Amino acid sequence: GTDSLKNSIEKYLKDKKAKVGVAVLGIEDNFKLNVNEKHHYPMQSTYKFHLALAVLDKLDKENISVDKKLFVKKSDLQPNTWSPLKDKYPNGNLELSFSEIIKSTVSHSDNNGCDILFRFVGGTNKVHNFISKLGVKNISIKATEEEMHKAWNVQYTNWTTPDATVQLLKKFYKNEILSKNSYDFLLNTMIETTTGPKRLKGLLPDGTVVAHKTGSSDTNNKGITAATNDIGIITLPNGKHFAIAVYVSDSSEKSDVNEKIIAEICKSVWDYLVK
Amino acid sequence: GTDSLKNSIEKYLKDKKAKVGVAVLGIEDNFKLNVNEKHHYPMQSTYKFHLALAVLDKLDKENISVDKKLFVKKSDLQPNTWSPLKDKYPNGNLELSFSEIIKSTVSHSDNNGCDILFRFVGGTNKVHNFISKLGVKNISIKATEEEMHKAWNVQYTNWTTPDATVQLLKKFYKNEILSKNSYDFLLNTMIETTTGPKRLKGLLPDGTVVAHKTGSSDTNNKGITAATNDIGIITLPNGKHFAIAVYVSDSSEKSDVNEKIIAEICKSVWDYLVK
Ligand SMILES: *C(=O)N1C[C@H](NOS(=O)(=O)O)CC[C@H]1C(=O)NOCCN
Ligand SMILES: *C(=O)N1C[C@H](NOS(=O)(=O)O)CC[C@H]1C(=O)NOCCN
Ligand code: NA
Ligand code: NA
């Protein structure tokens, strides 16, 4: 039962030197599980999911095709950050579609793409309000990637509870947020995600569909990695779905262990739900 | 004359809110120019040039082909840093040649590749000593990319004078450091560099050969960008060469202006040397 799975997870976490937030919500059925869920966890790149929702909603509502192109200035592509876009287009100063920018932002976690889209959409407070007005409490979106890169503590202003994340993912999945078209596009993009292959996906059978979004922080001079996260919707072998979110925060563990925590917890929920 | 070029550069720098270090050394002739050269500038990624020298020297001396492969563990490919390798190989755990790793490290500034190679070569102190024993004073190599990412001030321990950089580049170029084979390989790799196209190269004629290596820091909460650098060897239209190094340090300027400083100073030296 849910209780026993939960006790298994808590016992697993006993000897891990990190503050680990877990939530699971069945999509089609009533399954629900929360562990350490009343803390505020730094989202890092996970909030590119939320940004993508606000962007596509804005494109939908204002009737703007995702094939329309922004001019991406050289200066939008900062060297001082994770950015496959910048490596693909080192000169910048070119026209890129919303589609290409979103795909790089979500599937490849582009930091520049993220901030290009915050600017397009009208800033962090626009996304913060958008998510809020969907009826999901306990998500704070306050800082761009550039803002977070300036100072360690800024990441903690972009925070969430893990149960708000899976409430949001479930709303998304049951297409309560977007048009059909934009829904399919974001969903595909999340399945096509290439980052964190040994996180949620790490110990599930080969080929399991995991539509997800990672996030990761740096480590400070005290050995603390603020955030090692993965959030997503996973397809069970009978075609049903669950939303899951895991936040490994303020960890003294090494990165292999931080990812393993996510993979093992996910594997434990998977095993329980398949039966 | 050299003096007047120098006064032009100093006058240019007058209204730039940054501490800018410049050195130029003719390769074949006696041209020499230094501006603010007695300060210690944070190298950032420029020190991947120095690392590559130590690596190739170690491969040369120990008779190890650059086509031999390291096993790159998942954990060598940290998500929390600029890394085209990691995006190309998200699962990690594969065999990569020294050649592929060096190319990504130098030409595409891979941070993971850098630290993989520090470990191969035997650590920062091995590279520090190697450079020292070449007869080039005033270069300090103390910290890996992972070490620098933990704390703001760590970058200042990897420091250089700009005239040590061009002394080093000149030694390299006149093939006083490596075997023929490893020389050609590093030189090609530096020409194939794709980063910072609007730095040294930014205002020179199209097609000018610039064998170079960039580096860039983050910006802190006070608006200071610690480092915006480019170092290289440039081919004049009569086939002669000059080494140049520019360090735009502790700048309150925006990134466009920081790069422009490098491009305009380089353009001024180019124009003087072509005549
Ligand atoms: C996201 O969390 N990012 C961007 C990128 N992707 O990582 S991942 O989403 O976990 O795969 C690199 C890590 C992180 C950063 O934003 N890293 O920058 C350091 C934080 N100031
Ligand atoms: C090098 O300076 N790097 C690595 C990468 N390349 O930039 S570039 O060499 O200027 O083109 C990104 C910037 C920089 C970093 O190491 N960035 O990380 C932040 C410093 N802790
Ligand atoms: Na931060
Ligand atoms: Na640093």
CATH number of the domain where residue A94 is located: 3.40.710.10
C-alpha Rg value of chain B to the nearest Å: 18
**Which residue among A151, A196, A218 sits closest to B149, beta carbon to beta carbon?**
A218
CB B165 within 8 A of CB B245: yes
Bridge partners, residue A139, by sequence = A160
- B:64-93 residues touching chain A, CB 8 A cutoff: 74-75, 78-84, 87, 90-91
CB A105 within 8 A of CB A81: no
Q: Do B150 and A220 touch (CB under 8 A)?
A: yes
Query: How far, in whole angstroms, is CA B7 from its chain's centroid?
Result: 26
Angle between helices A2-13 and A255-274 (to 10 degrees): 170
Instruction: Report which of B176, B143, B161 is spatially closest to residue B57, judged by C-alpha positions.
Output: B176
- Which structure tokens are listed for A270? 């998977």
Which residues are CB-neighbours of B72 under 8 A, at least 6 positions away?
B85, B89, B92, B93, B94, B95, B96, B101, B116
- List Cα–Cα distances, B16 to A74, B80, B82, B156, B268, in angstroms: 20, 32, 28, 21, 16
Written as one letter, the residue type at A47 is Y
Q: How far is A234 from chain B (nearest CA, A)?
A: 19
Neighbours of B18 (CB within 10 A): 20
**Which residue among B75, B151, B197 sits closest to A220, beta carbon to beta carbon?**
B151
Residue B200 to residue B204: CA distance in whole angstroms: 8
Considering only the C-alpha atoms of chain A, give the largest distance between any 2 of them, rounded to a whole number of Å: 56
Instruction: Report which of B192, B168, B211 is spatially closest to residue B104, judged by C-alpha positions.
Output: B192
Question: Could you tell me the resolution of this structure in angstroms?
Answer: 2.0
CB B31 within 8 A of CB B273: yes
Decide if A221 touches B, using CB distance below 8 A: yes
Which residues are CB-neighbours of B177 under 8 A, at least 6 positions away?
B53, B57, B134, B171, B183
Residue A85 to residue B135: CA distance in whole angstroms: 40
Domain membership of residue A85 as a residue range: 1-275
Method: X-ray
Q: Is B62 exposed, middle or buried (0-12, 13-18, 19+ CB in 10 A)?
A: exposed
Is B45 considered catalytic here? yes
Count of domains for chain B: 1
